[PDB]
Design a protein around this ligand. Structure first.
Ligand SMILES: CN(C)c1cccc2c(S(=O)(=O)NCCCCCCCCCCC(=O)O)cccc12
Ligand SMILES: CN(C)c1cccc2c(S(=O)(=O)NCCCCCCCCCCC(=O)O)cccc12
Ligand SMILES: CCCCCCCCCCCCCC(=O)O
Ligand SMILES: CCCCCCCCCCCCCC(=O)O
Ligand SMILES: CCCCCCCCCCCCCC(=O)O
Ligand SMILES: CCCCCCCCCCCCCC(=O)O
Length: 578
């Protein structure tokens, strides 16, 4: 294209472009003020408008990277503030940008963004929505460099959707909070998800990713033929590589390409994309990414024909082990959108293992005749965990369910820090709440997604804060071994009950009117340490100690009750629990 910025501006919109450029600059110039970026945006935007006005206007012809880099090198505070990031400015573009990528900082070290009071927000919103949206856009972008700009934008507009919606409702907070919390969550899952997706590719391997991808793709596009799914995973793996590589523009293009490829091939891919393809370049790939599984073809055959019965299972497998395995995965996944990808991978890894084993032996067919029976222990297992957990959760609610989880895991991994156990437990509960509402069919996918994110947040938090080798194990496990390993975490019977400490167990009227979250967190962190000091305590002895608390607390909110009515709880339980 003549002038890529003219182009971009025109095929994005003034708005989207201002937002993206902001996000873009916010993401490198993470220690720069809002107004400086706004200045740059304005400086970039207006310039772009000249490039639009006339695609031949000086500097319009320049690469979106060059402009961007130049624009980055126009920031005066650039050497003082970004130090060596500024040295990038001396490098010629190909290197200049790759140098700016290097100097993007994932854990950039910023104040936690503190959700202001609704009214404050709702008013700042109403007054200067544009500034509102961008100022926070700014904060989230610089906090999340690497976080894919357009998506951030989509959260942005969803944030706008939540403010426009809630800032004119009877109870603003009753409306917004849940919504900002939804967005807060999904913003984190999405950030956590990207974090992961890039780590995934590197540690677990391009293979593992392609496998994961094929399974996903095939569940999402059952009626797509394997050659098609594979095309998509080859390209998806590429776009993915580039988005991880971090460069927004390349990445964005790659995803645009793919999305266009996928829209000019909806018939070959999915019938559920009509919606996703009528959308603008911007929303395309992301809509696509999020698209739901297409209906699988009416009455498909077992995989027994191609993977057991076929004469040439072994020949086909050996002639291209990974294509075949992908075909298995394809055929298995397409048939099972109900399975979590990793499951499919476990099944495929399994069918790979026996093929490896069998195809060598005198009679493979005999040997691998019952390979699918090996698939049941693997399918049911995580299927059971859904039934079981969604049962547990339906008999307990999000909250007491987290508490269920908390004691389960604190018992499983007592060394893990308590805030961690509280969060992963809390998030776990949340994913329980989220995926259990889902029907049996969509449950496992759903879980796996949140799960791998929860697990990964847990796992990387556990990295260089390590406390349980068994976790480091479950963390340094295979993409597919990860969750099982965890689900294989027993109670740490070598665990020495952490020595008692009254302070963690003394609470105050603080508790009675803390936000219902803080309440839960303090209760759950309490419940945790409770298990940490008394690992060996039956669901009998705990519903005991907890039903105490519950009573002990509402039968208190003259608040020195906590120092005394507390004292009793502290010693009563201590003795009761052996
Ligand atoms: C590349 N990665 C990690 C992926 C992100 C989101 C969805 C993905 C799906 S899917 O079945 O859930 N979605 C349908 C195909 C998505 C094609 C649209 C491109 C969006 C992916 C961009 C995100 C990225 O490449 O990291 C299958 C395979 C990979 C996906
Ligand atoms: C030779 N090359 C480069 C290849 C050609 C064609 C397909 C290929 C696939 S694939 O995604 O299309 N096929 C699915 C991969 C099979 C993986 C099944 C086992 C699960 C992971 C293995 C064990 C582990 O590391 O967790 C993956 C990797 C390489 C492929
Ligand atoms: C500096 C001006 C250009 C800013 C554009 C960078 C972000 C690219 C937006 C195009 C969106 C790609 C499609 C997608 O979301 O997958
Ligand atoms: C406590 C977990 C969330 C509540 C119910 C769903 C989670 C259990 C499902 C485990 C399977 C997820 C990944 C996998 O396929 O192994
Ligand atoms: C503290 C470890 C969290 C362990 C949860 C790992 C598996 C949760 C998925 C469902 C497992 C039960
Ligand atoms: C060792 C004796 C001190 C008592 C330990 C208090 C920890 C109990 C946490 C409360 C769990 C939630 C119960 C509820 O839903 O109210």
């Amino acid at each position: 294209h003549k002038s890529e910025v003219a182009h971009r501006f025109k095929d994005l919109g003034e708005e989207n472009f201002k937002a993206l450029v902001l996000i873009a600059f916010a993401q490198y110039l993470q220690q720069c003020p809002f107004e400086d970026h706004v200045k740059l945006v304005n400086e970039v935007t207006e310039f772009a408008k000249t490039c639009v006005a006339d695609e031949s206007a000086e500097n319009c012809d320049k690469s979106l990277h060059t402009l961007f880099g130049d624009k980055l090198c126009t920031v005066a505070t650039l050497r003082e503030t970004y130090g060596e990031m500024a040295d990038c400015c001396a490098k010629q573009e190909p290197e200049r940008n790759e140098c700016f990528l290097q100097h993007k900082d994932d854990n950039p070290n910023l104040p936690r963004l503190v959700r202001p009071e609704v009214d404050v927000m709702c008013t700042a919103f109403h007054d200067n929505e544009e500034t509102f949206l961008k100022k926070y856009l700014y904060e989230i972008a610089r906090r999340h460099p690497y976080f894919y700009a357009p998506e951030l934008l989509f959260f942005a507009k969803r944030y706008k959707a939540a403010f426009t919606e809630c800032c004119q409702a009877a109870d603003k907070a009753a409306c917004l909070l849940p919504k900002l919390d939804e967005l807060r969550d999904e913003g984190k899952a999405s950030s956590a998800k990207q974090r992961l997706k890039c780590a995934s590719l590197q540690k677990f391997g391009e293979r593992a990713f392609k496998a994961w991808a094929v399974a996903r793709l095939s569940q999402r596009f059952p009626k797509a033929e394997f050659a098609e799914v594979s095309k998509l995973v080859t390209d998806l793996t590429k776009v993915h590589t580039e988005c991880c590589h971090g460069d927004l523009l390349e990445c964005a293009d790659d995803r645009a390409d793919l999305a266009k490829y996928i829209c000019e091939n909806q018939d070959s891919i999915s019938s559920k994309l009509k919606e996703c393809c009528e959308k603008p370049l911007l929303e395309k790939s992301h809509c696509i990414a999020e698209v739901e599984n297409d209906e699988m073809p009416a009455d498909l055959p077992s995989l027994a024909a191609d993977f057991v019965e076929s004469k040439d299972v072994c020949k086909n497998y050996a002639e291209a082990k990974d294509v075949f395995l992908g075909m298995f995965l394809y055929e298995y996944a397409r048939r099972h959108p109900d399975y979590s990808v990793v499951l499919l991978l476990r099944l495929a890894k399994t069918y790979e293992t026996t093929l490896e084993k069998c195809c060598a032996a005198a009679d493979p067919h005999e040997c691998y005749a019952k390979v699918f029976d090996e698939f049941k222990p693997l399918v049911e297992e995580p299927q059971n965990l859904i039934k079981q957990n969604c049962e547990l959760f339906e008999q307990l609610g999000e909250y007491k369910f987290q508490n269920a989880l908390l004691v389960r895991y604190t018992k499983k991994v007592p060394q893990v820090s308590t805030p961690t156990l509280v969060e992963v437990s809390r998030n776990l509960g949340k994913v329980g709440s989220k995926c259990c509402k889902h029907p049996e069919a969509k449950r496992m996918p759903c879980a796996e997604d949140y799960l791998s994110v929860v697990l990964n947040q847990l796992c990387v938090l556990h990295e260089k804060t390590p406390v349980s080798d068994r976790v480091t194990k479950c963390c340094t496990e295979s993409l597919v071994n990860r969750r099982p390993c965890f689900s294989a975490l027993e109670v740490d019977e070598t665990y020495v009950p952490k020595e008692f400490n009254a302070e963690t167990f003394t609470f105050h009227a603080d508790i009675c009117t803390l936000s219902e979250k803080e309440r839960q967190i303090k209760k759950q962190t309490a419940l945790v340490e409770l298990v940490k000091h008394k690992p060996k305590a039956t669901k009998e002895q705990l519903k005991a100690v907890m039903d105490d608390f519950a009573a002990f607390v509402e039968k208190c909110c003259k608040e020195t009750c906590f120092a005394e009515e507390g004292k009793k709880l502290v010693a009563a339980s201590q003795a009761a629990l052996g």
